[PDB]
Design a protein around this ligand. Structure first.
Ligand SMILES: Nc1ncnc2c1ncn2[C@@H]1O[C@H](COP(=O)(O)OP(=O)(O)O)[C@@H](O)[C@H]1O
Ligand SMILES: [Mg+2]
Lengths: 574, 619
């Protein structure tokens, strides 16, 4: 676990003089629990060995003061232990989120959207729950041993060799069991997550598994996961069964030799009798501090794989960044000039796009079209720099797009992605993203252009109906038209629709396009669609098939010149 | 909300009945291995008392009897010391007698060595009996999953069944290995540790058992005072995951429309307030021990003071008070973890009756073994009247007859009973008062496996288990070489975009770069159904997210090009369904009107007024 420590020494840096106030209070709280037997050895030696009745009762005052000093610095240690372990976990996810927000589409989609939330919310909280458990209930095992040795040195140091020999063998016989247990214990968590995934896949596809009658294959691929998990959990419990017995045997043998080697001293007259009572409690306190500390070491293997994922997110250098000298035109009015752009995944056999070359003039409209998987899905995300072109160049009216500040680029591109996503809140704050200062009557214009006015106006509170988290209350084209209106009130120089009108029907698609043509009379519109009924009115249309372009023109000059486009539009008539 | 605690507990305990030999030998081995670590301190105290008796007795006048020595001590003014001398067994003038001390310690060491291999075996057998009753439960749940009807799976919440076979078996394993190892032993260390602690002194044992009520009231008052905070932090972390989810899932819409600054400020303003909410919840719930250990020392101080004051009076011996200290330490340990042993038992018994409720549900219809074979395909229905829940009939009377080699194509508005009809054909649900006869023989009395393995179905939603694209495509026929997987992966047009991916046919599509589209995930599923070589093929809107040209190519190369088999083609785009052998227009059951495309369009019906929403563009 070289990543858990590299990620653990990095983010709890500011809380150095807040764990130094915990490792100095866990010392007072453990040298005060070791001092109660120390003073009990004086009750037995100064009040019991003699008559001295009052020395037993007046030495209980020292015991009552110590038990209060031991709790004021033990509840005052849990106040600073779970105050640096909450700053680590705050600063950790505040740095995971800040790094994720720098990702591009290619890097964000490589991790996901749920495997990236469970990597910053409940994944941090495992290392964050490890820090508050390793400074409040796990450093007391080394402390109760090291300070126990010094207490046994303070009291009749002649017989401190027992505690100098009994520990070096309690942390060495426990470092062997743990050394052999850790590798067999991190392999058991990757193996119980391999059966929770088999069950998850079987339950989700329980309707298709039965369709192929592939039930002899299931629960035989589950019988090889259950019987494999039960061989790594029956083996990790083969070492975990040696922790209590060996640790308690070391303490018991040390305790038994203690009375012999202490009686040999007491008979000689160089030792008192209460020292045995004190040492027998030092050993028992060390046993108690070691057993419960080694019983909660299950956290380390399960929080060292969380750190692997967090460090995998945090060690992903982004590849799309602003240039050191970005060109800043006064206006970025749409003129796209894609020349020879070839986008290829790293290591892929065939590039997604290859030698695509088309330009759109100032205020016209283009429509790219092709079969599923034929590149066009990735063409939109190149104009707004959600992907990097590998061996080509696209330029917007004066400059290569990657030689242009990405924020000023996005400030005049109204993007409507493949799936309409709306943010939690109200329609007034969901379609506010376009302008953020639009007047109330101005947001009634996009909803009319996007053919979305007649469902948000037929509501009690007008344009204030609450939207769900992902906008799931609006089922389909309702969400799509709200997303269209969001970009409609931005007056962009480039409208960029990526499979937007597919969710809509045919009449509302033609209505929205007519509204755009009557409103955005000079904006550059780039429409991507698998339909043809939304492509007729485009000023120019291009077809791309398996990457490369196959034909560029208008509808009439391409319906009788491109066989691919002809057979594309053939499956459209009724 | 754990609506049963008695019957569930007895059923979970009787689950260990098959492993009763390894449970009886754990119960009897964690008793003789724990009542030997209790009598160990008594032997140790006797060993230390043999030292004290000689040490405080070797300086007395050698020759005088014990009573005479006590009288002499009391006669010189030493009263408490005289009581001390009378309180133990001394003989003046004799030393320690190390023979007795050595023999006592050689027995303490012997039964300390025996007690350590009597607990290692008790732990090994306990591990074996736990990790063998867990396998049985996990293999009984998996055998029940493949027998429940679909009406059970699709009538529950989104993750209701998932977090019952996955998270509810882990809790059962925890609360079946913690209440046999950690809860049973820390009740014998409260019974024997207390019955040996009472034969020593019944007064000092009363200064220790009034710290059970004190350590329980305080641990029940801390927990039931840290509730305005343990809920106000679980709710404040719910506003963190509800913001990260909507800023990660709509990340391309946060980047564009550049509200990165706003979405980061909102995160930073509710992260600084979940830190504060978690601070209190981890402080108050973290100070639950520094307080039950405070009354583990308020008792220790009283025990030590009274024990010393009572040894000095001679009512008890030093070797008894040394053992009493160890008994106090062993008795005051099971209390510091009595809440973290009881809340993980309620949790583990609450998520242990849901599992048995799942196992107690009704199985499927107990199919009849006949092995029906489809020869030509005569899928003919006869007055099917299926209804999901009594009171809302979903599919009414209909008599859609198929043909041996045609491709009957079902069309209709959403929610008209198309996917439900596909579910009826596959016997996922049972038809009510209607024949569903496939090639003359009724499939209502036919083994489900033989029928389903011969149909071949693809649905609107796709299933892709955790594996490579090759493994997903080869799932329809797992005994086919790659020359038959790639072959039937070119008719589904997955080859043209699979090389686009960084490592095609091995992309491991459960953790990929999100480079597989929604229609690309349907082409993979179609390629899986092509492998099986079905004889009655049904495509229930499987080509919905794919192109309408690839749609017409696939359902012309493996749905019309197949002269041998018949096919149902359910889709919403009528362009690919026209000229396709008996289109059936259906509206909430009750097939309105049917026929081929020409006769169906040349009659001016619902089909005619439905083919203008797509072609005429009038709505
Ligand atoms: N498993 C089910 N449990 C409860 N209700 C269902 C179930 N399946 C379908 N329904 C309801 O019955 C109706 C059946 O329509 P459906 O067959 O889904 O038509 P389509 O497939 O064209 O959407 C749906 O509106 C749905 O709400
Ligand atoms: Mg359907």
């Amino acid at each position: 676990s070289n990543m858990l420590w590299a990620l653990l020494r990095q983010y709890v840096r500011p809380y150095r003089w807040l764990l130094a106030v915990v490792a100095v209070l866990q010392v007072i709280s453990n040298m005060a629990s070791l001092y109660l037997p120390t003073v009990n050895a004086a009750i037995i030696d100064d009040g019991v060995a003699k008559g001295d009745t009052a020395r037993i009762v007046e030495l209980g005052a020292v015991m009552l003061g110590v038990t209060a000093l031991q709790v004021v610095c033990a509840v005052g240690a849990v106040f600073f232990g779970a105050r640096a372990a909450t700053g680590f976990g705050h600063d950790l996810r505040a740095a995971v989120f800040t790094h994720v927000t720098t990702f591009s589409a290619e890097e964000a989609g490589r991790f996901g959207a749920a495997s990236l939330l469970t990597r910053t919310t409940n994944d941090v909280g495992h290392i964050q729950q490890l820090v508050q458990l390793t400074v409040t209930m796990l450093i007391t095992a080394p402390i109760m041993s090291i300070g126990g040795i010094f207490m046994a040195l303070h009291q009749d140091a002649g017989l401190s060799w027992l505690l100098l020999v009994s520990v070096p063998v309690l942390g060495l016989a426990n470092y062997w069991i743990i050394r052999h247990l850790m590798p067999v214990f991190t392999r058991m968590q990757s193996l119980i997550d391999g059966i929770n995934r088999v069950l998850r896949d079987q339950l989700s596809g329980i309707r298709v598994i039965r369709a192929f009658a592939r039930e002899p294959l299931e629960r035989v691929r589950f019988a090889e996961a259950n019987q494999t998990l039960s061989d790594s959990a029956l083996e990790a419990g083969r070492w975990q069964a040696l922790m209590l017995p060996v640790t308690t045997l070391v303490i018991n043998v040390s305790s038994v030799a203690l009375i012999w080697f202490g009686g040999l001293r007491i008979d000689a007259g160089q030792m008192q009798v209460g020292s045995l009572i004190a040492f027998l409690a030092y050993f028992m306190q060390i046993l108690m501090a070691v057993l419960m500390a080694t019983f909660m070491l299950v956290i380390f293997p399960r929080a060292a794989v969380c750190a692997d994922r967090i460090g995998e997110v945090l060690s992903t250098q982004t590849a799309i960044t602003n240039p050191a000298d970005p060109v800043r035109p006064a206006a970025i009015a749409g003129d796209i000039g894609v020349h020879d752009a070839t986008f290829c995944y790293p290591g892929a056999d065939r590039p997604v796009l290859q030698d695509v070359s088309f330009t759109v003039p100032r205020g016209t409209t283009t429509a790219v079209v092709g079969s599923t998987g034929s590149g066009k899905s990735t063409l939109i995300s190149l104009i707004c720099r959600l992907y990097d072109v590998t061996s080509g160049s696209l330029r917007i009216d004066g400059v290569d797009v990657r030689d242009l500040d990405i924020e000023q680029l996005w400030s005049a591109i109204g993007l409507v992605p493949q799936r309409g996503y709306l943010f939690s809140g109200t329609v007034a704050e969901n379609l506010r993203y376009g302008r953020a200062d639009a007047t109330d009557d101005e947001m009634w214009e996009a909803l009319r252009v996007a053919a979305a006015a007649d469902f948000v106006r037929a509501h009690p509170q007008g344009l204030d109906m609450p939207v769900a988290q992902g906008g799931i209350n609006f089922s389909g084209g309702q969400r799509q038209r709200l997303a269209i209106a969001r970009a409609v009130i931005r007056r962009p120089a480039i409208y960029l629709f990526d499979d937007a009108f597919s969710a809509l029907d045919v009449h509302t698609d033609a209505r929205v396009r007519d509204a755009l043509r009557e409103v955005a009379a000079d904006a550059t519109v780039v429409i991507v669609s698998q339909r043809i009924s939304t492509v007729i009115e485009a000023d120019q249309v291009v077809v791309i098939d398996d990457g490369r372009v196959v034909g560029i023109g208008t509808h009439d000059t391409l319906l009788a010149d491109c066989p691919i486009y002809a057979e594309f539009a053939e499956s459209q008539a009724l | 909300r754990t609506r049963d605690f008695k019957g569930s507990a007895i059923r979970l305990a009787r689950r260990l009945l098959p492993q009763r030999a390894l449970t009886l030998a754990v119960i009897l081995l964690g008793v003789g291995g724990i009542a030997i670590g209790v009598i160990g301190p008594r032997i140790l105290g006797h060993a230390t008392d043999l030292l004290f008796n000689g040490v405080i007795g070797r300086e007395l006048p050698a020759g005088l009897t014990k009573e005479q020595a006590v009288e002499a001590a009391r006669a010189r003014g030493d009263g408490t010391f005289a009581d001390l001398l009378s309180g133990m067994d001394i003989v003046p003038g004799q030393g320690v007698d190390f023979g007795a001390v050595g023999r006592t310690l050689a027995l303490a060491l012997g039964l300390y060595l025996v007690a350590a291999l009597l607990v290692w075996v008790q732990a090994r057998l306990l591990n074996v009996t736990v990790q063998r009753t867990m396998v049985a439960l996990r293999a009984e749940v998996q055998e029940k999953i493949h027998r429940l009807p679909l009406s059970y799976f699709d009538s529950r919440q989104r993750g209701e069944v998932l977090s019952r076979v996955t998270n509810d078996v882990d809790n059962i394993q925890n609360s079946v290995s913690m209440t046999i190892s950690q809860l049973l032993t820390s009740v014998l260390t409260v019974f024997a540790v207390l019955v040996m602690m009472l034969t020593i002194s019944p007064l000092l044992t009363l200064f220790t058992v009034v710290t059970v009520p004190a350590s329980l009231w305080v641990t029940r008052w801390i927990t039931r005072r840290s509730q305005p905070l343990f809920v106000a932090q679980w709710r404040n972390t719910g506003r963190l995951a509800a913001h990260l989810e909507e800023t990660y899932s709509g990340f391309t819409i946060v980047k564009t429309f550049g509200h990165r600054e706003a979405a980061a400020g909102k995160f930073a303003e509710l992260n600084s307030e979940t830190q504060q909410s978690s601070f209190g919840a981890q402080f108050f719930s973290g100070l639950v021990s520094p307080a039950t250990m405070f009354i583990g020392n308020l008792s220790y101080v009283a025990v030590a003071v009274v024990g010393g004051l009572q040894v000095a009076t001679g009512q008890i011996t030093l070797g008894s008070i040394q053992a009493f200290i160890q008994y106090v330490r062993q008795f005051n340990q099971p209390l510091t973890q009595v809440a973290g042993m009881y809340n993980t038992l309620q949790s583990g018994i609450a998520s242990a009756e849901r599992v048995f409720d799942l196992l107690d549900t009704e199985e499927e219809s107990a199919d009849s073994p006949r092995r029906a074979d489809v020869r030509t395909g005569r899928v003919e229905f006869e007055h099917v009247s299926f209804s999901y829940v009594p009171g809302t009939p979903v599919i009414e009377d209909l008599s859609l007859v198929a043909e041996p080699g045609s491709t009957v194509a079902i069309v209709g508005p959403t929610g008209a009973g198309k996917t439900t009809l596909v579910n009826l054909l596959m016997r996922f649900y049972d038809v009510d008062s209607g024949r569903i006869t496939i090639d003359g023989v009724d499939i209502a009395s036919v083994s489900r496996e033989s029928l389903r393995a011969s149909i071949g179905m693809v649905l609107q939603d796709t299933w892709l288990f955790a594996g490579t694209i090759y493994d997903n495509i080869a799932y329809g026929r797992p005994d086919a070489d790659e020359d038959e997987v790639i072959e039937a992966a070119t008719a589904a047009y997955v080859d043209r975009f699979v090389h686009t991916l960084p490592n095609g046919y091995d992309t491991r599509v459960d953790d990929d770069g999100g480079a597989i589209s929604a229609g690309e995930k349907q082409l993979i599923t179609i390629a899986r159904a092509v492998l099986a070589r079905p004889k009655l093929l049904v495509l229930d809107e499987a080509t919905s997210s794919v192109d309408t040209r690839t749609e017409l190519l696939i359902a012309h190369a493996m749905a019309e090009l197949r002269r041998d088999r018949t096919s149902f083609i359910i889709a919403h785009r009528l362009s690919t369904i026209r000229d396709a052998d008996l289109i059936l227009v259906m509206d909430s059951g009750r097939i309105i009107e049917r026929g081929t495309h020409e006769e169906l369009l040349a009659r001016h019906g619902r089909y005619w007024e439905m083919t203008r929403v797509h072609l005429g563009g009038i709505k």
